[PDB]
Amino acid sequence: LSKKAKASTVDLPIESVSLSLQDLIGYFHPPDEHLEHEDKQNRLRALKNRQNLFQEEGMINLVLECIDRLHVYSSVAGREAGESWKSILNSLYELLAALIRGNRKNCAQFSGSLDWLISRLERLEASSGILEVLHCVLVESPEALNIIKEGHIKSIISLLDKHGRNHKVLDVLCSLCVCHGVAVRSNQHLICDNLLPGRDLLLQTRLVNHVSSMRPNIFLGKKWYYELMVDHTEPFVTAEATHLRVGWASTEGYSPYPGGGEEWGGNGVGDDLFSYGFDGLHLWSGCIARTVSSPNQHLLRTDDVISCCLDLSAPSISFRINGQPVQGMFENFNIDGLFFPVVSFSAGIKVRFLLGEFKFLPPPGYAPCYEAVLPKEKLKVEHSREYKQERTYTRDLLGPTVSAFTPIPVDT
Amino acid sequence: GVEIETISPGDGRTFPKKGQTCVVHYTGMLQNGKKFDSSRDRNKPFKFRIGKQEVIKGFEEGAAQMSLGQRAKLTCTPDVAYGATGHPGVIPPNATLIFDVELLNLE
Amino acid sequence: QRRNPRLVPYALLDDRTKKSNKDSLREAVRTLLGYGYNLEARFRIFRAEKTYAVKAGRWYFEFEAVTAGDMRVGWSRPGCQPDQELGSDERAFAFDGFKAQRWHQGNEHYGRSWQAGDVVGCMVDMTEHTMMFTLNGEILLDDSGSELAFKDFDVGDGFIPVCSLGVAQVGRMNFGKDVSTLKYFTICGLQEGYEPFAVNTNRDITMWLSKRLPQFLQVPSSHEHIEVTRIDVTQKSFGSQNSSTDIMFYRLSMPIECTYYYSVRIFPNVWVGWITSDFHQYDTAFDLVTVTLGDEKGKVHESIKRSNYMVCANNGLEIGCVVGLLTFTANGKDLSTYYQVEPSTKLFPAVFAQATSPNVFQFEAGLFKSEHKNPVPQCPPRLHVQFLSHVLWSRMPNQFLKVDVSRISERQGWLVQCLEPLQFMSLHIPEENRSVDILELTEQEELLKFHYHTLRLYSAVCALGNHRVAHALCSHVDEPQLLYAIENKYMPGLLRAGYYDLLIDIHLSSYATARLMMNNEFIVPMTEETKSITLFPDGLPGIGLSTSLRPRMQFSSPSFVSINNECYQYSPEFPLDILKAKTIQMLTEAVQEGSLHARDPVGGTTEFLFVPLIKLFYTLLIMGI
């Protein structure tokens, strides 16, 4: 069938050779641990003797030809009897691992074809088979470690680069690094050249303070307004500076989930969140951090005043610090649910509220939060919509949901 | 000749002179915010000497433009950095070594 | 209506000004009675950690109900899905005090109703599969009137307590630990031989409540017919033609940050776009968001943002050409000038579609493949097994974040005030970017294992003294990250031992073996302080004389100077007496709890508690500390 065809190819062992291939595998099977320790060795001695009689007749080469002559297609021939091509190829590697696993004498005289092997590593039909052949040959002979060179490793890491994540491929590199007892240094500095500096394929890890936000019990749709002030920052108690972001956010959207989606929780890193406040005051609006300046480059120090505002019937968000202009940026938004101050923090921090109990206010935009308490609705600053609640006896439950300034007359 | 932005203003006039132990406490991350050094972490005030070609040229240029108490975002250039070689193991080629410094004392 | 006091809706405003409209209608009613026309007439499921599921004993807990509604409190197999709500299969085993029907694949009448302020109590036999429910001591009875709740289930993978909240419901639980709150455990319980969930334990029990936020997954077989096919030319087809044809949100595997294109062939309503990972809208709507500039004076101040999700709508052959910035293409025509504003933003390819016909896709001015993976000679488009066809699924369990914060509040100016920091412990997959905290991996074994073998590789690369690479990893693992990761009493067992290995193989090995070599040499000078050794107490091997040679410690600080042939000598440095002080604590801390012999211990088994704890202590014993 490497020719055109014959259409009466009687020489077709498929069911016969697949039967013997499942028969040859168990013939080289390792003995189980739950066994009498003397009976383990007598089975083991017959096993190690069994491999060496296959070696001198050169069966590994005779196996390797059938892998070669089946490395032709990618799923062929008369494709009803030859339909089982995935079985015979995949079972051939699992045989080939069995002729290897214990003997140093069988590994070293084999060795010689890893450069042939990693050439075939791209086939990806039974790569986990041809990985397994590579894993046993590396751990069992320190000879073959001084044959595999840098171009083989670049093809090894690239298969991890394409095929997601495998603890099997990492067991190669752990065994490729340190031999039986010695640590060949040329492979170690080769690896940290590739895997490490990209931060691309493994899992990078960090730690930052817990982030929590707040709300003053009051939904907000005249030109709505509030005020804030700061007392003690102390920006460095971490291996990090702290954060301070103030702004507005929606109510029918983004349940307050700390650090399971976006980084650490945060403020302004969701689309429903719109925060501000920085040293060099620039923003956070849905993972955006672009660097629109202010004509002070001033801190969030221990004394400053925050003026925040949003007009009615105008999606036009802009704030002020100490009555000084910030060159506002936030326009063209959407509404589904009302809004509120969403001050967040992660420190040993302490700040004030200004509600009425006001201290300082610029004029423009005339509806403070003091206006939002007209009919009956009370005011209690809390931990921002609270899928949790923190306690000391048992942090108990809280249900999923319980849910307009233009009232509606019936058209009668 | 690199982008230097003052985070927290110190006084400006305290120019660091050659032959001074510039005690800093700094950190720095990559283009994607991936950290690669934090002297705050190991609790070590990093000390160095100007003009002696100790740290790379981006840090060496941005160290002169600061003052005492001045935090600064030394957004360095890959050409001024380790370059298309990088640091073999830590830093890939062509990176933006965005630093975050704070001067403490001089000598 | 400018100083208007009427900016208030009806149901909230002053109820005495409406009495001018109420009593005027009542005088309009007093006339009508005078005229004879008398005016006559989702859920929030709370499961625990899977590794707490007992399999042999008589275990008890109680539940304190507050409100009215669905209170499905009881037990559960660990494989209970969060999505399909409670009891309607063989995975949950509970009872709702409302509606008086017990929960196994449905409902069947049992027991009596709840009371606001009840203490339920739940009792399991494990020697036999006979479950029981109580209510305030009073045992809830069957239709035939027996004490049991369920019968002849399967003790397989254990049983976990789960409450199910309704819509506006409030409940309160206890799992041992609260010996004053054992309300009706005194009467039934101990006098039946039952056990709380703190019979020996010492920590708390972290819970995995269902997140309201949706995320994406793979394409498993959990449907009647949802199927993705990997065809090479280079296409992927689908099908969802069943009696459940609601909504399908298709994300792809890996993003693109800021040349070539990508196609779609639909057989039969359709939104094509590009997704950044901050997208969790799960409905059928058309919603979403820009920001203008600030240019230091005003008057220009026009354009920063276009960030959102992207929008498009025989064969529908739309093509996503990208970079540079974002563009569009549609069937040879040009719906161009897309949302071309992206500095370095992540871009999934993403289409949304619903079932009208099968085979709703077929996937793919050069060609694509190189623009996604690492190598870029790579002209032909090639499919890869990393590619998945992610479906935005509704809910998965997520940990409680057991210790939150110490926030306070005030009124006179409303002083909120904190004092102490509480730090995360978080990692992220970079290739499908999303942050997970470390203490979540206890249920993701396919990511626990792969990250555990990553730490085996870090311990083995810097093995037997490679101070170049150990310095390269010290800027990669960052030692006070370890100093928290030593002490998480809820960290998994493998990641306990992996981090203790990685601390030693960076810092505490190359000196440790260096004193291990010279352990049998005993060379000594004949100086004067040597003469003052008595050999005898009138023994203690913790003496401080030690006049042997003892090869010295040197260290190096992992800096970033251009003196690159000076790392090169000893080891990365570390803070010493911070470490030896915590171990002396953690030795006394661990041996005290294990003397009580908890069900808990730190890494599941007592080995993962003790084996790295001794091994770090043993290596530190040799190091001259």
SS3 per residue for chain A: CCCCCCCCCCCCCCHHHHHHHHHHHHCCCCCCCCCCHHHHHHHHHHHHHHHHHHHHCCHHHHHHHHHHCCCCCCCCCCCCHHHHHHHHHHHHHHHHHHCCCCCHHHHHHHCCCHHHHHHHHHCCCCHHHHHHHHHHHHHHCCCHHHCCCHHHHHHHHHHHHHCCCCHHHHHHHHHHHECCCCECHHHHHHHHHHCCCCCCCCCEEECCECCEECECCCCECCCEEEEEEEEECCCCCCCCCCCEEEEEECCCCCCCCCCCCCCCCCCCCCCCEEEECCCCCCCECCCCCCCCCCCCCCCCCCCCEEEEEECCCCCEEEEEECCEECCCCEECCCCCCCECECCEECCCCEEEEECCCCCCCCCCCCCCHHHHHCCCCCCCCECCCCCCCCCCCCCCCCCCCCCCCCCCCCCC
Calpha distance C371→A13 (Å, rounded): 45
Calpha distance B91→C472 (Å, rounded): 9
Calpha distance A359→B56 (Å, rounded): 50
Q: What are the structure tokens assigned to B104, written together?
A: 């403490």
Cβ–Cβ < 8 Å for A94, A25: yes
Neighbouring residues of C428: CB distance < 8 A, sequence distance ≥ 6: A203, A204, A263, C434, C435, C436
Cβ–Cβ < 8 Å for C292, A329: yes
First-to-last CA distance in chain B? 25
Q: What are the structure tokens assigned to C443, written together?
A: 């249920």
Give C166: exposed, middle or buried? Use CB within 10 Å, 0-12, 13-18, 19+: buried
Given CB atoms, is B84 within the 8 Å cutoff of chain A? no
| Bridge partner list, C248 | C353
Q: What are the structure tokens assigned to C601, written together?
A: 């211990």
Cα–Cα nearest to A24, from A61, A51, A49 = A51
Q: Which residues of A fall within a CB distance of 8 Å from B38?
A: 239-240
Of the partner residues B35, B37, B43, the one whose CB lies closest to the CB of residue C560: B37
For B100, the enclosing helix (H) or strand (E) is strand B98-105
**DSSP state letter for C530:** G
Q: Find the discontinuities in chain A where C to next N exceeds 2.5 angstroms and give the residue preceding each.
A: 75, 221, 356, 403
Q: Which residues of B fall within a CB distance of 8 Å from C346?
A: none
Calpha distance C334→C363 (Å, rounded): 20
Task: Give the pairing of strands C392-393 and C348-353.
Answer: unpaired
For residue A192, the chain C residue with the least C-alpha distance is C469
Calpha distance C510→C462 (Å, rounded): 10
Residues C75-93 as b/e (b if ≥16 CB within 10 A, e otherwise) read bbbbebebeebbbeeebbb
Q: What are the structure tokens assigned to C196, written together?
A: 């709380």
Q: What are the structure tokens assigned to A301, written together?
A: 């120090």
Given CB atoms, is B12 within the 8 Å cutoff of chain A? no
Calpha distance C345→C277 (Å, rounded): 10
Q: Which residues of B fall within a CB distance of 8 Å from C558?
A: 37, 42
Encoded amino acid at A316, one letter: S
Helix (H, G, I), strand (E, B) or coil at B75: strand
Cα–Cα nearest to C458, from C485, C432, C440 = C485
Task: Give the pairing of strands C44-48 and C163-165.
Answer: antiparallel
Helix (H, G, I), strand (E, B) or coil at C434: strand
Question: How many other CB atoms are found less than 10 A from the CB of residue C162?
Answer: 24
Q: What are the structure tokens assigned to A11, written together?
A: 């020489």
Residues 48-67 of B with CB under 8 A from A: none
Resolution value (Å, 1 decimal):
3.9
| Backbone dihedral angles phi then psi of residue C210, each to the nearest 5 degrees | -75, 125
Q: Which residues of A fall within a CB distance of 8 Å from C21?
A: none
| Backbone dihedral angles phi then psi of residue B3, each to the nearest 5 degrees | -65, 120
Question: Cβ B8–A299 below 8 Å, yes or no?
Answer: yes
For residue A269, the chain C residue with the least C-alpha distance is C278
Calpha distance B103→B11 (Å, rounded): 11
Of the partner residues B31, B36, B53, the one whose CB lies closest to the CB of residue C475: B36
CA dist list (Å): A230 to A86, A237, A302, A308, A354:
69, 18, 6, 14, 11
Calpha distance C495→C499 (Å, rounded): 6
Residues A31-57 as b/e (b if ≥16 CB within 10 A, e otherwise) read eeeeeeeeeeeeeeeebeeebeebbee
> From which experimental method does this structure derive?
cryo-EM
Nearest C-alpha of chain B: how many angstroms from A191?
9
Question: Cβ A236–B86 below 8 Å, yes or no?
Answer: no
Calpha distance A4→C270 (Å, rounded): 47
Active site residues of B: 26, 36-37, 56, 82, 99
For residue A195, the chain B residue with the least C-alpha distance is B89
Rg of chain C taking only CA atoms, in angstroms: 33
Calpha distance C219→A371 (Å, rounded): 51
Cα–Cα nearest to A225, from A216, A237, A234 = A216
**DSSP state letter for C381:** -
First-to-last CA distance in chain C? 80
Neighbouring residues of C580: CB distance < 8 A, sequence distance ≥ 6: C620, C625
List the Cα angle C283/C286/C287 in 5-degree steps.
90
Q: Give the CA diameter of chain B.
A: 38
Of the partner residues A188, A237, A401, the one whose CB lies closest to the CB of residue C167: A401
Question: Cβ B91–A299 below 8 Å, yes or no?
Answer: no
Task: Give the pairing of strands C101-103 and C92-96.
Answer: antiparallel
Chain centre distance of CA A72: 37
| Backbone dihedral angles phi then psi of residue A369, each to the nearest 5 degrees | -65, -20
Cα–Cα nearest to C280, from A285, A365, A286, B10 = A286
Given CB atoms, is C99 within the 8 Å cutoff of chain A? no
> Which regions of C52-157 does DSSP assign to beta strands (E)?
58-65, 72-76, 92-96, 101-103, 107-109, 122-125, 130-135, 138-139, 148-151
Q: What are the structure tokens assigned to B16, written together?
A: 């660091």
Cβ–Cβ < 8 Å for A218, A382: no
Of the partner residues B35, B43, B56, the one whose CB lies closest to the CB of residue C575: B43
Residues 334-353 of C with CB under 8 A from A: 343
Question: Cβ B89–C558 below 8 Å, yes or no?
Answer: no
Encoded amino acid at B78, one letter: P
Question: How many other CB atoms are found less than 10 A from the CB of residue C395?
Answer: 20
- Chosen for mutation from A262, A284, A297, A302 (greatest number of chain B CBs closer than 10 Å) is A297
Q: What are the structure tokens assigned to C126, written together?
A: 């494990």
Calpha distance C608→C586 (Å, rounded): 14
Question: How many other CB atoms are found less than 10 A from the CB of residue C270?
Answer: 17
For C21, the enclosing helix (H) or strand (E) is helix C19-34
Given CB atoms, is B43 within the 8 Å cutoff of chain C? yes
Given CB atoms, is C562 within the 8 Å cutoff of chain A? no
Question: Cβ C427–A203 below 8 Å, yes or no?
Answer: yes
Calpha distance A116→B82 (Å, rounded): 37
Q: What are the structure tokens assigned to C560, written together?
A: 């970033």
Calpha distance C348→C215 (Å, rounded): 14
Cβ–Cβ < 8 Å for C509, C619: yes
